[PDB]
Amino acid sequence: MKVRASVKKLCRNCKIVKRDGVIRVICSAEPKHKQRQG
Amino acid sequence: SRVAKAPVVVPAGVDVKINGQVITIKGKNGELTRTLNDAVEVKHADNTLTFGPRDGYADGWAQAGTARALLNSMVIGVTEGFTKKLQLVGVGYRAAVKGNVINLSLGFSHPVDHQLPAGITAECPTQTEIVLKGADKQVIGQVAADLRAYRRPEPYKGKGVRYADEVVRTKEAKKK
Amino acid sequence: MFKAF
Amino acid sequence: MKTFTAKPETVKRDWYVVDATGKTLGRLATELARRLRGKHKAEYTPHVDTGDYIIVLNADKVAVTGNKRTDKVYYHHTGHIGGIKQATFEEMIARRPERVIEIAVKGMLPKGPLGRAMFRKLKVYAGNEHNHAAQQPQVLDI
Amino acid sequence: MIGLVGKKVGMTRIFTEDGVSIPVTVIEVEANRVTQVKDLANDGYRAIQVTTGAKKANRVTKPEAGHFAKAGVEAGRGLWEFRLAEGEEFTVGQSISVELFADVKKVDVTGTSKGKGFAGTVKRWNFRTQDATHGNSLSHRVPGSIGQNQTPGKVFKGKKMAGQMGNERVTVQSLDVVRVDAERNLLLVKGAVPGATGSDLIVKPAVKA
RNA sequence: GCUGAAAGCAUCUAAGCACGAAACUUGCCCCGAGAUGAGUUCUCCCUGACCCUUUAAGGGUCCUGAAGGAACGUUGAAGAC
RNA sequence: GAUGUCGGCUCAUCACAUCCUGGGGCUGAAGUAGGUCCCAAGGGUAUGGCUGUUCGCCAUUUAAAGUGGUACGCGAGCUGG
RNA sequence: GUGAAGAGGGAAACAACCCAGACCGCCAGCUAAGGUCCCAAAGUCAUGGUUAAGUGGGAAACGAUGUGGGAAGGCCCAGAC
């Protein structure tokens, strides 16, 4: 997981989801995609 | 709120009781019970369970859908037992069932012993795979996760414990 | 005693 | 003529019992602080403790709005360097359910010898029963 | 589990056929007479009050002798308490001897340490001594700095300084029980224990386990 | 991570559950009721005459001197005192 | 009409932008060993040669020899190169 | 313009900001700024909305199916998404 201020869709399979008041990205195909806002 | 609109049928041989917010579903596979939140209103005025949001609650519509999904799975549970199949992959990976407790070998220096909850049952057709059967979809789902947690599937070779239908994205090891 | 330059 | 002033050796004091079950901590505290200071009495005097005795029951059942049931933090310093201690609302209820009321009320009462004396009339209990039946407190609803 | 009160008779050496020498502190544990039993319904905690030894009858105050008379016991050196877990019970006047430790591998020993009086920082806190030469002026073994100038402007609580050392309760944990001699009321424990010879001593089962 | 909607799917989360570190609260050790919110338990001691008016948690005389403590003396592996 | 400096010595205390130990996500992570990011301040966090030196270089160690604030902490505490 | 050479009330404390120029006395009243749950004088005041972050009670580029409102457009019971 790579943490950075800007979270975006890097590919089609990516999705943005809010879990605990923090925006993070979950990708089913490529775990490199997943990020957290911080 | 499409899920909430769809009613849930209670066929013959299934008994359902409503007492305020708590509901008790009974069937041939056992019994189940949970306490619904005050924001969801459930009625038993017909042969099908109907759901609606209680007035004054903003989350009622979204909350109503959860009750339909939860009760819909529960009625299935009492009629049929949810089944989870896990597969063991490895050179010397084996599983054994002593009853409420399962003994696994996963290359550890110590034995792995896991006890099941009262509402779950397990049995071993073969030492390379294990099957979990139960009435409640929640605990049975949790049991498999803990079973899978001991050795999550190995990326470069796939060895470990995995759901029977799981797909593992094998990755080739770095060359040179 | 002391100095400060 | 000179304005009337209350006499600490002639003031009349009566006992009350309050149930804290389901009451919001802050708004219950203000009423308790108002009563302990005697602001409701027509003979209120700033330099005389004219308040009444208050008994608080079910101190563990007080309610707090929002997410502060877990985000409310209580701070106190032991006096030693680095001796800063933390205690959330849940921890205080679990450990000492009675301190939540007194800490809230204590910060609402005046400061100084008179304020401490007024606090001494507050008697909080975690359970539903109290041993002060001899005082025959009246049921007071807030 | 319940312990016992003994006296530090001294220190001795125990030889073993294998050729190893075990330094053992000899502790004499006379009969321990229970003087009172503490109950939840009346006292709020479960414990037993015990006395050991004997003291001259001319110096037992009837407030103390009456306490002993209540339990039908002879006045001892002093009174000590031990907490009771769920499984143990005792009766007033019951006498407990050293065999209680016959099944105990490890024991806990507590007592008052030897009193060193007013001790300097070097002895009390292992402070490093400053230069004995090279120009040092009347500051060979003084504590030195004790603060950080204006910003704090004070000395923090708990600062290590010269003061009373020793003469305080100390507990030594996980002491092996070498031998129990119930025919002479003695307990042998490997290693040294706090206090001087003849001082009161409290022995309890090893809590550390 | 489980179940799972808002969003027919998906989703660790919004309702409801599980795991998770030398940090945190305990566990271990020491001080500790000046904790004036001054706590509890067990024993021990005292069961007389009167007198005055400002007649009240009043003052005073006689008798009495308990429990215990202190002081002094011999002293301590206790201690600057 | 006076707040005494660099460095050393002694004694420290706090911050976390963490050097070691602890828990994790990715890895162009086979393993061993690393890279990077996240959580974590509980403890621990070299002796010498040269130089007044801090620093630095060098020698040899260590799980590591952290970065800073505190009058570039500390001379009514020492030293005075 | 104010302080300097200006008190008083407000901004927690705070010469220069806001309100306002103290001849003396009063246990009278009405107001300014600013305020009315408690410390602490006055609304736990009456309506219609927004916020769930204790935002309010510090901070940007930038990021995000947070959530409320408004005006349009594409597809759509010839079956859309």
Ligand SMILES: [Mg+2]
């Ligand atoms: Mg004030």
Ligand SMILES: [Mg+2]
């Ligand atoms: Mg001594």
Ligand SMILES: [Mg+2]
């Ligand atoms: Mg000199």
Ligand SMILES: [Mg+2]
């Ligand atoms: Mg000298």
Ligand SMILES: [Mg+2]
């Ligand atoms: Mg100060």
Ligand SMILES: [Mg+2]
């Ligand atoms: Mg001067």
Ligand SMILES: [Mg+2]
């Ligand atoms: Mg800890």
Ligand SMILES: [Mg+2]
């Ligand atoms: Mg060096």
Ligand SMILES: [Mg+2]
């Ligand atoms: Mg040389």
Ligand SMILES: [Mg+2]
């Ligand atoms: Mg300096």
Ligand SMILES: [Mg+2]
């Ligand atoms: Mg110097």
Ligand SMILES: [Mg+2]
């Ligand atoms: Mg100085």
Ligand SMILES: [Mg+2]
């Ligand atoms: Mg010189």
Ligand SMILES: [Mg+2]
């Ligand atoms: Mg001038």
Ligand SMILES: [Zn+2]
């Ligand atoms: Zn992606």
